[PDB]
Nucleic acid binder design. Structure first.
Lengths: 124, 121
RNA sequence: CCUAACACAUGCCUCCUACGGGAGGCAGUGGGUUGCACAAUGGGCGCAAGCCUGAUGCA
RNA sequence: GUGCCAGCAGCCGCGGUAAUACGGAGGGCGCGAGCGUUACCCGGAUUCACUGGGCGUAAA
RNA sequence: CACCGCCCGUCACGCCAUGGGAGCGGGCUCUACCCGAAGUCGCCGGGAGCCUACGGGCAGGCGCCGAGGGUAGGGCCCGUGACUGGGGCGAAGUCGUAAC
RNA sequence: GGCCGUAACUAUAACGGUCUCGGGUAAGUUCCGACUGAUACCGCCCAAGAGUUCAUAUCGACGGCGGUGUUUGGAUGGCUGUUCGCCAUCUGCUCCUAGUACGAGAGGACCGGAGUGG
C-alpha cells in the first residue's frame, strides 16, 4: 500500500481466537459427566478412545478425552477438564485431569505418573 | 368475581395482570370478592420470579371495588382488584411480602400469613 | 479471594413486634488467625500527663 | 506380561506373538523436600521480518 | 490387488455436525407523553398559626428540578423457537454410468 | 404413466430393470409458520373358563329366550353450524364427637350435634 494509504486506512492488527472456551479463560474448569461413551479414531487410526460429555460449571457442555490405561468414570461423576485437543477425536478439545475429583488416577503407573495423577509407588 | 376480570398481584413473583378464569365455591358461583379463593392465570409477569407467564393457579382476593362492609354497615371499598397468588395444591400464599392494605375479613383464621404483612388494616 | 461490587453471626433483603411500628476496615461464616501490643514510627484530641489508634509494629 | 486388545501419546508415532514406545520387574538417567502436570507470557518463530522476510511456477 | 480399474449425482441408512429465521421473553443503548419521593432552591407566608426590639424569623403552602414508576415505539446481544435449509466421511444400500 | 429390485441400524433410494410439528390460548375442528323390530339398546337362561385357590365379589366363551320402540333399516368456557365430540377449569364445607372405633403404619369413620356457604 502507498504510505498515504497506510496513513488513511493503516494496518489491521491480528485477532487471536481462543481454541478452548473453558470460559472465563480459566486454566481448568470442572464439570459433570453426561455420557462415558467411546469413539473411533480418524483418517488413518483405529481404536476405541474413551471419551466423556461434560457439563461445565462454565455453563458449556463439552466432550473431553480420558487419558490413561483405564478410567473409573461414570455418569454424575464430577471431573476436572484441562484443555488439550486430540488429533483423532474432532470435537474433543480438552483432556480430563486424572487424579482430580471423581477421576481416579491410573493404577499401576510407574513412569510419567504426574501426568496421570498417581502417587509415588511405595517401593519396599 | 366472574370469569375474565383483570386482577393485580398484591404479593409477588409474576407481575401485573392476572386472569381470573373461574370462581369456586361450587356450581354457579357467579362472583367472589372480599377474600375468596379464585382460579387465576398470569398474563404478564416480571422477567424474573419463580412463577412465569400463563401459569394456571388459584389465588385470593384482597382489595376489590365491590366493597366489603359489615357491622354498622359502613363500607371499605378499594378501587383496585387484588389477587395474591397461593402455591396451588399444598395450599398456602406463595411469596414473601404483600403490598398495600388488606381486609379485616381476610384475617380469616386459616389464612393469617398474608395479614402480618402489607402493614395495613 | 485472580471467582461472587455475592449474603454476611460475633468482637473490635435480614431481623425484632405487644402488628400499631421499628433496626440494620481487621479477624472470621456461608456460598462460588474470630492472635499480641502501645514498645517504636505516623495520626486525632490535650498546655501536658496521657487517652484513643485491627493505621501500624509484630506473631 | 499383553497380542491394533488393554493402553501410551507433545510431535513423528507405538500396540495385530522377539514391542528398548503399553503393564510390571531388574537395572539406569535426571532432579531432590521436592518432583511432575495443567494454564498463561516471552523464547525457539528472520513464522508480521525496524534490527530481519517475501510475491514468474510455492501464499502473494 | 492395476479396465472384472476408477468414478459421479438423486433418494435411502450409518459415526458425526449444524446454519438461516417470523415472532415470544430478557438486557444494553433511548424517544414521547402521564404520575412523581427525599432534598436544595424559588415565590407566598395573608384579621389562617408560633416568636419579635416590628426590622424579621419559624411553621405551613404553592412551584421548578428531580430517583423512580406508568402506556406506546426502537437498539443491544443472550434465550427459546412451530418454519425452513441441510453439510464432511463411509468397506456389501437404490436407480442409472456423467467423468478418467 | 405404471410395476419391480437396490448403499453402512433400520426406514427412504440418488441407482438399475422393465411395460403431523411449531406458534398464539388456561383450553384454538378457525388462524399463522412448516305397521314391522331383522338391526340396535336393555334384560334374563346354560356355565367351559379368570379370578393364587374358588364358575357366578367382579367378569364370562360356545350357544339359548325375551323387553323396549330408541339406533340402522323394510357447569362455565376454547374449537366447530354442529348435535356430538376432544380440551381447559337441592346440597357443599368446617368444627365437636374423635385423631377415637378401626389400622402395621399411612390414614381415618359410624351415630348424633353445632356454624357457615353455593
Amino acid at each position: 500500500p502507498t504510505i498515504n494509504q497506510l496513513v488513511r486506512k493503516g494496518r489491521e492488527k491480528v485477532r487471536k481466537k481462543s481454541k478452548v472456551p473453558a470460559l472465563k479463560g480459566a486454566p481448568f474448569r470442572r464439570g459433570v459427566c453426561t455420557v462415558v461413551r467411546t469413539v473411533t479414531p480418524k483418517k488413518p487410526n483405529s481404536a476405541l478412545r474413551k471419551v466423556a460429555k461434560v457439563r461445565l460449571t462454565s455453563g458449556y457442555e463439552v466432550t473431553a478425552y480420558i487419558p490413561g490405561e483405564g478410567h473409573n468414570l461414570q455418569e454424575h461423576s464430577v471431573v476436572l477438564i484441562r484443555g488439550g485437543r486430540v488429533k483423532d477425536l474432532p470435537g474433543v478439545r480438552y483432556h480430563i485431569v486424572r487424579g482430580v475429583y471423581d477421576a481416579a488416577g491410573v493404577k499401576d503407573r510407574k513412569k510419567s505418573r504426574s501426568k496421570y495423577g498417581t502417587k509415588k509407588p511405595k517401593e519396599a | 368475581i366472574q370469569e375474565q376480570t383483570m386482577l393485580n398481584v398484591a404479593d409477588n413473583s409474576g407481575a401485573r395482570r392476572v386472569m381470573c378464569i373461574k370462581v369456586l365455591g361450587g356450581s354457579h358461583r357467579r362472583y367472589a370478592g372480599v377474600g375468596d379463593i379464585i382460579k387465576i392465570t398470569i398474563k404478564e409477569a416480571i422477567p424474573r420470579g419463580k412463577v412465569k407467564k400463563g401459569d394456571v393457579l388459584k389465588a385470593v382476593v384482597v382489595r376489590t371495588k365491590k366493597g366489603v362492609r359489615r357491622p354498622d354497615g359502613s363500607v371499605i371499598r378499594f378501587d383496585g382488584n387484588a389477587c395474591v397468588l397461593l402455591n396451588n395444591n399444598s395450599e398456602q400464599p406463595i411469596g414473601t411480602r404483600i403490598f398495600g392494605p388488606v381486609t379485616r375479613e381476610l384475617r380469616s383464621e386459616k389464612f393469617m400469613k398474608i395479614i402480618s404483612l402489607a402493614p395495613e388494616v
